[model samples]
Target: SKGEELFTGVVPILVELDGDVNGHKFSVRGEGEGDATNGKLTLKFISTTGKLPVPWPTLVTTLVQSFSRYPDHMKRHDFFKSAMPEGYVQERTISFKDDGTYKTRAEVKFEGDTLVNRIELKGIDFKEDGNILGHKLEYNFNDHQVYITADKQKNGIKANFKIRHNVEDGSVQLADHYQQNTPIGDGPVLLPDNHYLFTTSTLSKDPNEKRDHMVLLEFVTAAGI
Candidate 1:
C-alpha cells in the first residue's frame, strides 16, 4: 500500500538586505504532502504578519528617489542600497497543505521606523517526472519581483532565477531599455540536503562597475519528513 508522505517544516530565507548586509535570515512555516504513487507534491504557506528590521517608509522613499539616477545604473543601485537599514532574523510561523496550487500572503510590518505592508509568494509549482523533479517559485516585494525555476535529477540540480525592478515610468529617457531585469545566477549548483541556496549579484550596464549588490537566498526545511 502506498501512503502519502507528509513533510512539514519551515522554509528559512537567507536574503541579502539593502546596503552590504548578506544572509539576513527569516522563515515561514508550511507543510508539503507528497504522493509517491503519483510523483507529485503540493506545498503552501499560511498567511501571517511579521516585522522587518528597517523602516518600511525609509526603504521605499530611497527606492523612489534612486529612480531619478537612471542612466547611471550603478549610482541608482548604490543609492538604493545605501538607504537600507540592517536586518535580523524573524522567527515567524505559517501553515501549509497539499493542493494543486500554492499561494501565500504575508504582511510585513516594520518597527517604529516602518508601516503596514506585505510580502507575498505569488505562486509555486512542484512536480516529479520520471527521475527528475521540477520546481518553480515566484514572489514579489513591492516593486521588486523574483522568479526561480529548477530541476533536480540523480546527478544534481539545474536552476535559473531572475529579479526584476518594476518602475512604471513612461519617460522616453527611462524606457524599458534602461530598466533592469536579468538573471543573476543560472546553471547547475550543489544544494545542501533539504535546503536550496540561491546566490546572485545585482545587474550593471557598465562593464567596469563593480557588482557588489550580492544577495543570498537559502530556503531550508526545518524538519525531515
Candidate 2:
C-alpha cells in the first residue's frame, strides 16, 4: 500500500493466498513452485540430461554438414540440423517467427538449397502496435557444413529470439515458444518454395490473425553484406 512495491502484470506461476499481515490487515501471500526441486536431485533423477528422450522437432540434427566439427555442443544441439535456426539472424533479410521456425518470400532467391553465412529474424506483428519483437542469428549453410549459434546480444529485450524467412514449408510453417526467446528458430520449414507461410498448431500461434487474414511475406537483403 506504500510506494515502489508496485504490483506489475500477470506472472504465470505465482500462487497467492489470503493472509493476515497484522491483526486486521490482510495481504496477498505469494509462493513460487518451480517445475522441480532446484538443488541436486535423487540418485535416479540425475542421469545426464543430454541422453534423455524427446520428439522429432525437439531432436537435434544429424547432418554431417550441419554437425561435423564439435560433434558435441554446450546445449547438446546438433549444429548441422536443428528444429530452429542455428542463430538469431536468418540469412540477410528473413525474419524468425515466434513458433521456432523460419520462412522467406518465395519471390526472393531462398531456394533452401544454397550455402549461407548465417540467418536470423526480426519483426513487429501487424497487431502488436509494431512493438519490436526480437532478433535471431545463425550460420545456416553458406558452406556445405552448417554452423549454428546463439548470440547473447539482443537475446530478446522486447521479446525472445526471432528470425524471418520468405519461403513456405522449408520456407515457412513454424511453431515456437510463447512470450520467450527460449530455443530460437532454425531456417526454412520443409519446402522453401511456397509463396506464403502458416503456423504449426503444436508450438505457438498468432491466433488474432488467421490464414484468410492477408498474410504478407517480405524479404529484406542489405547491400553486399
Candidate 3:
C-alpha cells in the first residue's frame, strides 16, 4: 500500500572501494539502490579481492544481506559491528561531515540488544561553507529507546546537548548532564514544558547543530534534494 509514502524511482549506484581493514588490503566493487532522496545504500560486494580476515567476509556478506535492518544515510555507524565477532577491543578511526554522513570506515558492538556508537565530525572546511560545523556525538539505540549526546562548537561557543526518547511512548527528556561515561543522559525522561524544539535548545549551546542529528536517516538524505 502506497498509502502515505511514494517510492517513485530507483537507480543503480556503482562504487569501487579500496582500503585496508583489520590490517589487510581490501578492495571491492559494490552495487546498490539509489534515489534523489534515498541515497546510495544496501551495497552488495559484486567482486572482492585482496587479503581478508576470518569472519570478515562472513560479516560483510551478512551486512549486505541483512542491510534492511540498518537504516541508510544518517551516520549511527556501529550497526555493522554486530556482524563482527565479540570480544577484544575493536576500534576504527572513522570520520564524518557535520551532517550525519560517513566519510570512510565503520564498526559497532552491543550488550544485550543495545547498540552504542561514538562519531567524530571532521574535515569541515574552515571557510564556513558546506556542512562545515565541528562536533562529536555519542548515541545508543536500546530497543525502542534512543539516547543522544551531541558536543559541538559554533560561533566560538561550546555546547553539549543530551536527549533521551522513548519511542514506545513518545516520551522525551533533557539531561542537564550525561550519566557516567555512557551516552545515557542523566536525570529522568522528563516531559517537556513547551514545544520540544524550544525547550530542548537551552540544553545545548549549538542547538541547531545538535538537532540536526535527531533527523531520521532517510529524511536527512532526502532533504538534501
- Per lDDT, the best of the predicted structures is 3
All candidates' TM-scores?
A: 0.19, 0.15, 0.25
For model 1, residues 1-225, the per-residue Cα lDDT tens digits are 000011112211211122211222223333223221222223332212233222221122111111111122222122211222221111111111221221222232223432112333222232232100111221112222222122233222222222232222321111011111111123222221332222222211224524212111112111111
Give per-residue lDDT, candidate 3, residue 67: 18
lDDT comparing candidate 1 with the true structure: 0.21
In candidate 3, where is summed lDDT lowest over 10 consecutive residues? 194-203
Candidate 1: TM-score?
Answer: 0.19
Residue ranges of candidate 3 with Cα displaced over 4 Å: 1-8, 35-42, 57-151, 154-225
Order of the predicted models by TM-score, top scorer first: 3, 1, 2
lDDT of 3 by residue, 102-179 (tens): 123222223333222212212212222222121111222211112322222210111123333222234332222111
Evaluation by lDDT, superior candidate among 2 and 3: 3
Against the true structure, candidate 3 reaches a TM-score of 0.25
lDDT of 2 by residue, 110-158 (tens): 1132212221222223222111111121212111111223333433211
Alpha-carbon shift of residue 117 in model 3 (angstroms)? 20
Residue 216 of model 1, lDDT score? 15
**Alpha carbon lDDT of each predicted model:** 0.21, 0.20, 0.24
The alpha-carbon RMSD values of the candidates against the true structure, listed in the order shown, are: 22.6, 21.9, 20.3
